[PDB]
Design a protein around this ligand. Sequence first.
Ligand code: GCP
Ligand code: MG
Ligand code: ZN
Lengths: 143, 23, 470, 25
Amino acid sequence: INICRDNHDPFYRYKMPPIQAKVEGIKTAVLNVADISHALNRPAPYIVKYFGFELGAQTSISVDKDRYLVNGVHEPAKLQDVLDGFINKFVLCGSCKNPETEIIITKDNDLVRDCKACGKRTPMDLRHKLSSFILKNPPDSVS
Amino acid sequence: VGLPYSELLSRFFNILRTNNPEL
Amino acid sequence: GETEEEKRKREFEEGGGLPEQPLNPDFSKLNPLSAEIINRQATINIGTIGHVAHGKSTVVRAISGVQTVRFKDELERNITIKLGYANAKIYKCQEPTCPEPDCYRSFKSDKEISPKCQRPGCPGRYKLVRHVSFVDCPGHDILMSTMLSGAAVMDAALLLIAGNESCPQPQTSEHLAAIEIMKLKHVIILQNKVDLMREESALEHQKSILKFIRGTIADGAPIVPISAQLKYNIDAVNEFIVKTIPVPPRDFMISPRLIVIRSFDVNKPGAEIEDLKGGVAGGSILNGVFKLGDEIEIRPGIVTKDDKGKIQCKPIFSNIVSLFAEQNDLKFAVPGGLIGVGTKVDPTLCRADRLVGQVVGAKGHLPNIYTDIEINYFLLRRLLGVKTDGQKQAKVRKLEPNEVLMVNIGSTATGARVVAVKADMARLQLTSPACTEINEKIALSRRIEKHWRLIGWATIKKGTTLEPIA
Amino acid sequence: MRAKWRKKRTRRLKRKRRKVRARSK
RNA sequence: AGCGCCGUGGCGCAGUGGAAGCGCGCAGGGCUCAUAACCCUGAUGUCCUCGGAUCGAAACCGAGCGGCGCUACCA
Ligand SMILES: Nc1nc2c(ncn2[C@@H]2O[C@H](COP(=O)(O)OP(=O)(O)CP(=O)(O)O)[C@@H](O)[C@H]2O)c(=O)[nH]1
Ligand SMILES: [Mg+2]
Ligand SMILES: [Zn+2]
C-alpha cells in the first residue's frame, strides 16, 4: 500500500491506498476512489475528473453507485502517476506537504488549498481545469 | 551491582543452545 | 485412567483447597502474611512499565497466567486504556535439597495452598509466601493519567527494556521518573529480549542500562533477563520480588478509605433482569479494613452545573453489597490490593471510564472536595519522552498564568487553570472535582508537543473546600 | 482551425500570466 | 453475550409462495470491404446446511452455519 506519494519514501506519514482498474468491454472501473477520497479530504469526482483532465478522453462518473469508469487503456502506473499529479498539485500543502488539505471557497470565489498542520491557505492553481470542476460543485454540499 | 544478572544471562544462553541448536 | 480435570480436583483437595475467610477474626493480630489473608487476597501491588509495543502484559501472563482482556476491537492490538489486572501466587518449596533458584513458583489465582512440586523427583509441597496483584500500566504517549494513577497505587515496580532496540528509550525514563515522583524506590529492571541476542550485545546493553541509572534516585535496582514468550526466568523474578521488596507500613490503625480507578457495571445481557446484580467499582484500599455490608460515599461523585454555571458535587453514598478480591468473594478486605467494591450503585454510573480516579470514604469520615488548591511544585531540567535527533533534550519552561495543566492528584485526572505562579508554589483552579485527604502525592503534566508531557511533582499545601450538599 | 478560439485562447493565456503576475507582485 | 440484515452465474439490484432472475460481464454468430455502435444466440450455478407446512419450497416457518449493522466490554 502506497505511502500516499510517489517520489517520497518515509516510514511515518498519512496514508493513501493505490487505485486499480477493471475492464468493461472499453472503460476501466476504478475500485479505490472513495477511500483515497476520504484519505485526502477531497470528493471522488475531483479524483476522477482530474484523471480525465490530464488524460483527454471521455469519462463516466457516478458517485451514488460505485461504478467509476474512465475510458482508455491505462496500465496501473499511468493512472497512479496522474493521481500523483493530483495529490502533489492538490492534496499536499506547501510547507510540510500535508496529505490532508481541503478545498475551500472564501467570500471571493478563490478556490484554495487549506491545511491543518501548517493550516495555510496555499495559493491554488486556479489555472487548471479541476479548479473549475471543484468550483462547479462546492465540497460536501453539492455532490 | 548487576553480577547476579549475568549468571541468569548465561543460564538463558545455555538453555537457548540446548533447545534450539539451529539458531 | 483419570481425566486431567479429576486429577486437578484431587491435588486441589490434597493441597488444602481455598478455605473460606472467617466472618469476624481478631484484626489486632492479623498481618498481611497471615494464612487467612494470603490465600484470598493480594497484599502487594506490583506494576509493570516499559516502552510501547514491548509486551508488558506478556511477561504478566508468563508470571501468573491470567490474561489482561485487551478489549474494544481497536484496542485488541494497539493499546488499552484501563489498567491490566492479574493475580499471582508466589509458591516457595519447603525442601532445601532442590536448588534455590527453581524453588520459587508463581501460579494463577486458582492454585491451592500446597500443590505438588512440578520439578521431577521432588516430593515437596509449595508453601504460599504471599499473594500479589499485578497492574499493567499503559505504555503509550497519549495515555498518561492512567499510568500515573497506576504508579500511585503501585507498591513495587518492574521496568522492562528490550535489547536490540535503541538503548535510550525515553518512555522507560518517563515511567521510572514518574515512579520516583510518587515515592517508589523498589524497582526491578527486566531485560525482555535475550533469545535473539549475541553474547557481546547483551553485555553492551547491560553496560548501557547501568550507565543510564547512575544519576537518578534509584540506585540499587536488580536487573533480570526474562523471556516473555519462552516462559523462563520466572522463578528468578519471583525470588527477587520476595527478597528486595518488603511490606510498606499498612496496618489497621489508619482510617478506612478507597481510591477508585476502574468501574464495572454488572448487567449480564440476554437474561431476564429479575435476576440481576449491582455495579462494581474497581478501587484500591491504600488504607482501611473494609468488610461486607458497610456504608460508603463517593466524594466527588455526581457532577452537575446549575443555570449560573456553578459546579455542584453530590457525594454518591452507597451500601456495599459485596467486595471481590483474588478469586472468591471475601468478607473483609485487606489494604494493599485492588478490590471490586460491588455496590447498589446505578448501572450507568459504572458503565464507561467514569469512576476513573475518584476518592471514596466509608461512613465515619469526611474527605473534603476542593475548588481552588495551593500546591508546592518542583520540576526537572528536561522533559522525558522527547526523542531529540542530536540536540539538547527540550528544556522545560516556567509555568504561566492562565495555562491548562493536567494535574494528577493521587489518581484523579483533572485539568487545572493556573491563577498564580511563584518560585516554589502555585495556585490551581479545578473545573473538575478533586478531594484532599492527607498528603496525596501529585504529578504535573503540560501540553508542549501536541500530547501530554510530565514536567514535575507537587504536594497539596492549601485549598478552598466545598461543603457537600446533603 | 477556428481563429475565434485561437484568439480567445491567447487572451486567456495572457489573462492567466497577468494573474500570476498579480499574485507574484 | 443478544437483537436487526444477507446468503449469486465473474459483479449491482430483486421477486421470493409455479422452481434459476435482468443489466453488466463473457464464447459465438449476425451487419459493414473493415472496426466499433448495434443486432442477436448461447455457459458457468448445489438463494447458505437440515427439517416442518404445501401438489410442489431457492421461496411461508423452523433447529442451525458462515458473514455483517448496534448494545458495549457488560462481576
Ligand atoms: N521477540 C519478543 N516479542 C515479544 C515478547 N513478548 C511479547 N512479544 C510480542 O509483543 C507484541 C505485543 O505485545 P503486547 O503485550 O500487546 O504489548 P503492550 O506492552 O501491551 C503495548 P504498551 O507498551 O503500550 O503497553 C506481541 O506480538 C508479542 O509477540 C518477547 O519477549 N520477545
Ligand atoms: Mg495493559
Ligand atoms: Zn498546508
